Amino acid sequence: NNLETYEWYNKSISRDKAEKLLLDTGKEGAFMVRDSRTPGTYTVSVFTKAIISENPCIKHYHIKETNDSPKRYYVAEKYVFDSIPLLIQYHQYNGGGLVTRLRYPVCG
């Protein structure tokens, strides 16, 4: 899938760089994605200035891969999406199962 079109998608970035890069934003909601070696199971790097023990903190919500049809990617046990662009958008607004409903994307 050509995710290079989106912003949250970033393969040229690693976890360490993902955790730091997001830190630069220093904004609550700052969310992004990081390609994974898997054949189809990227990762949603969610950064939200929260937590007391460790702040800031990065939430690595690894899209639950459900090799089914449909049933594929999802992160909330609520609803399942057959694509990442949906899970990323469905959370942009409305409401879902996310510590900090996505509302602020990041880019390189």
Place this chain on the structure above:
Amino acid sequence: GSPEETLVIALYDYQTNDPQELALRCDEEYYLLDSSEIHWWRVQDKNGHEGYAPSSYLVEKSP
């Protein structure tokens, strides 16, 4: 003292955006029923308000 279930609290003043989510009153507190989840930790308000509460804004009180 944190035997089987720990307790968490909201750092800021997170507000519920949906019935599913659990409203928090910066200073409130509850218990932990599902810490296995990476997103929400099904907590139970003393009043009886059970809902998905934000793990981030939350943190195990611990001893």
